[PDB]
Amino acid sequence: EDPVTGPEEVSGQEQGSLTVQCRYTSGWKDYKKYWCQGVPQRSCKTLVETDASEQLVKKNRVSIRDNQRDFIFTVTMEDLRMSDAGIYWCGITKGGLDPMFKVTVNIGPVP
Amino acid sequence: RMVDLPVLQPRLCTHARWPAPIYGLLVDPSLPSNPQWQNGRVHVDGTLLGTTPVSGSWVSCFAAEAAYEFQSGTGEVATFTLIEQDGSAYVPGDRAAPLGYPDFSGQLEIEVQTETTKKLKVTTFEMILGPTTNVDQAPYQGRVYASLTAVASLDLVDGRVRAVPRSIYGFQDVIPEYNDGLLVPLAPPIGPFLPGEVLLRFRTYMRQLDAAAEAIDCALPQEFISWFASNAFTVQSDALLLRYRNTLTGQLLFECKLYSEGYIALSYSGSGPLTFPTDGFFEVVSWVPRLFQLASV
Amino acid sequence: RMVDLPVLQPRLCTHARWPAPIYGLLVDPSLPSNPQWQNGRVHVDGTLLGTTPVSGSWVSCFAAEAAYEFQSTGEVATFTLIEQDGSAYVPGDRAAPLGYPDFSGQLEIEVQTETKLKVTTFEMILGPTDQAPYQGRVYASLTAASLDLVDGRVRAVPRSIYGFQDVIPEYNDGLLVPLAPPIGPFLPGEVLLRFRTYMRQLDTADAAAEAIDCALPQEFISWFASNAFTVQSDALLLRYRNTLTGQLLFECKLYSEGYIALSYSGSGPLTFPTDGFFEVVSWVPRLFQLASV
Ligand code: NA
Ligand code: NA
Ligand code: NA
Ligand code: NA
Ligand code: NA
Ligand code: NA
C-alpha cells in the first residue's frame, strides 16, 4: 500500500478549475506537501508547497491546503489553459526519495 | 623535456565526459563559451582538475556501498554510500564528487551487478543527476539515491557496486546537484579566451531516451589527460601553439592555442558550427604568450 | 629515447579486454599459460597486434549497420560490421574489427534503437557454438511481437555475459582467421603477469569467478603506440615498486612482444598490491633469470 495516492487522470477546461485530492498515510502528517510539474520525475518543478501546517499556500494559479485530520492535501489549479496539460505529481518532502504519485492532467476547450 | 602530444587521431581517442568514442571535432560559437565541465579537466603540467580521473573507464561512472530496500509506490530503492572507483574511501575535499562522477544533468540510467538471497544479474536503476532534484543528491557528501519501478521486492543483497551509465533522459549540459543544493568546490569555467577565440570541442553522442543525436563535448581526449598526468611537463608560458595536421600527408588543417589550463582555442568568427576532420593529429610547435594571435579559420 | 613507463598505478588504469577498471594484479600457474587474446596486444615498439584498439572505449564493443527482423524466435538483428570510427571494415590481417570481443559465451549487448529512441538489449552468441565477424557479419536476437525497429547504424556495448569462456570466439564460422600469436614464449619457471578485472556474468554466483585478465593496461598500450620506442633486446627488466616508499616488490621481464613474465613456482594464484608502479631498468636477454616471487 502506497504512501501517497490520488487521481491517475484528471480533466479540466479553459478558464475552469480542477481539484486534486492527494491522500497520504498518517505517518506523513507533519511533512511538507507539494505539487510538482513535469518530467524527469525526480527533477520536476515544484509549483507550490506547504510549510507542514494546514495553512493554505497559493502561488500563481495553484493552491494547496493540507488537511492533517483526514490526511489529505488538496491541490487546486485555477484559470486553466491548454499549456497546463501534462504530467504532475502529488509530493511529500523527505530525505532522499520522496513519496510521489503521478497525476496526468488533460485540458480541453469549453464546448 | 619539452611538451609534446601523442600523434593519436581524435577519431581513435576516448571521450572524457561520456564513455564513448570521439566522433567529432568542431567549434560552435552558439554554445556556451565558458562551460564548467568537471571531467576532462587537466593542466598541461599534469595536475588533474575537478573530478577528472586518469582512466577513461571511470568517466561518468561511480562506485558505492549499496543498501537496498523495497518501497511500494517507488519500487526497489538503493542508498549509495559513495567510494572512489578503485575501492578507496571517498573523502569530501576540494572536488565536487568522487573522480569520474557525472558532471551533467538529467535522469541517468545506471547498471550495477546485483544478487539475491532467493546467480548474479545486472540491474538497471534510475538515478536523477540534476540540475535540481527532490532526492537530496549529495555526491560531494558521498550520498546518492536511485530507484527502479517494480511491483515487488527484488530481494537484493547489500554490497559494493560499480555503476556504469546506460542512457540519459532529459540531458542538460549543466553541472548536477553535487551537494543537496549547497555550493561545492568546482574547477573554474573553461577560459578565458581572447577576442575572436572559441573553444575547440571533442564531441561524442550519448545514448538517450528522449530522434536527433545527443551531443556532448569535452576539452581534451582522455588520452591527452593521461598523457599530461604521466609526463608532468614543465610549463614555460601561458599557452602552446599547436598545429592540427593530416596523419598520412602532414597537410596543415588549422593552428590553435593549448592554454596551460587545459583547453584549446581557435580563432573563428563564424556564426554557426564548423566541424573538422577527425583523422588528423596535433603537434606542439612552441610556447606562446596569452596574447598570441592565431590565424583565423 | 630509452623505453620508459608511466608511473601510473594498476588500480588507476583501464583494462584492455573488458571495459572496466583494473582491480587485480597476479600470477596464476593454474590458468592457461599461453592465452591467445586478440585485444590488449601491442609490441614495445608500438605496433598494435590482433584486434587491439587504441581507445579503451572500443574494447569488447562493435559498430554496425543494423537490419532488424521478426520471426515468430523473436526479434532478430543482422549486424553488418563497420570499424567503430565509422570507416568501412575490410577483411584483412586481423580476426575482426578493432575491439571486437576476443572471448566466448553469450554476450548481452546494448544498442540505440528507434521504433522514439530507446536502448535495447540483444543476445549475441560469440561461439564457437554461424557468426562471422571476420566477414563483417554477426547476428543477435531478442525474445519477443515485432518491435517495429528502424534500421540504421548502431554502437553495441557489453552489458553482461552468459557462459563465459576465455577462448577466442567464432570469428569465421569455425574457419581460421589471422590471429595475433599466443602469448609467449616463457622461460622455465616464468609465468604471465595478469592485469585483472571482473566482468558481469549471469551464470556465476561468486563475484570472484568473474575474472578476466589482460597482458597490459590500456594506458601502456597507448603509451607504446604513441612513443614508438626502439626495441633493443628480447625483454626489458622492470621493477614494481611501492608508490609511497619506493620499496621493491618484485622484478619482472617485459618481453618486447608485449607481455610481462615473473619467476614463480607456486601452485596457486599469488596476488600483488595494485598501488605500485612499474619502472624500466634496462634491456635484458631472453635467458635473463628473474628472482623468484
Ligand atoms: Na502541510
Ligand atoms: Na563530476
Ligand atoms: Na545543478
Ligand atoms: Na527528498
Ligand atoms: Na545488416
Ligand atoms: Na577480437
- Quote the CA–CA distance of B294 and B253 in Å, as a whole number: 13
- Quote the CA–CA distance of A24 and A43 in Å, as a whole number: 22
Spatial contact of B216 and B39, defined as CB atoms under 8 Å apart: no
What are the C-alpha distances in Å from C90 to residues C38, C94, C132? Answer: 17, 10, 13
Q: What is the distance of C-alpha B132 from the center of its chain?
A: 19
- Number of other residues whose CB lies within 10 A of the CB of residue C148: 11
Minimal CA–CA distance to C19: which of C200, C207, C276? C200
- Quote the CA–CA distance of A79 and C40 in Å, as a whole number: 65
Does the beta-carbon distance from C55 to B21 stay under 8 Å? Answer: yes
Is some CB atom of chain B closer than 8 A to the CB atom of C20? yes
Method: X-ray
- Quote the CA–CA distance of B280 and B8 in Å, as a whole number: 8
Does the beta-carbon distance from B130 to A1 stay under 8 Å? Answer: no
Assign C109 to helix, strand or coil. strand
Q: Indicate if the alpha-carbon torsion angle C88, C89, C92, C94 is positive or negative.
A: positive
Q: Is the peptide bond before C91 cis (omega within 30 degrees of 0)?
A: no
Q: What is the distance of C-alpha B97 from the center of its chain?
A: 13
Does the beta-carbon distance from B6 to C226 stay under 8 Å? Answer: yes
Is some CB atom of chain B closer than 8 A to the CB atom of A4? yes
Does the beta-carbon distance from C55 to B13 stay under 8 Å? Answer: yes
Q: Which chains touch B (3 or more CB pairs under 8 A)?
A: A, C
Spatial contact of C217 and C16, defined as CB atoms under 8 Å apart: yes
- Quote the CA–CA distance of C171 and C137 in Å, as a whole number: 10
In the numeric block, which cell numbers belong to residue A45? 518543478
Beta bridge partners of B67: B79
In the numeric block, which cell numbers belong to residue B240? 602552446
Q: Domain extents for chain A?
A: 1-111
Superfamily of domain A1-111: Immunoglobulins (2.60.40.10)
Q: Residue C228 contacts by C-beta under 8 Å, 6 or more apart in sequence?
A: C45, C46
Grid look-up 543525436 returns B213
First to last CA, chain C: 31
> What is the set of domains in chain C, with CATH numbers?
9-58+163-285 (2.40.510.10), 59-162 (2.40.30.120)
- Quote the CA–CA distance of C123 and C126 in Å, as a whole number: 10
- Quote the CA–CA distance of C97 and C83 in Å, as a whole number: 6
φ, ψ of residue A82 in degrees (nearest 5): -55, -35
Chain C interface, mutation test: which of B117, B166, B207, most C Cβ atoms within 10 Å?
B207
Assign A96 to helix, strand or coil. coil
- Quote the CA–CA distance of B23 and B27 in Å, as a whole number: 14
Q: How far, in Å, is the centroid of ligand 2 from the Cα of B82?
A: 13
**β pairing state of A33-37 and A45-49:** antiparallel
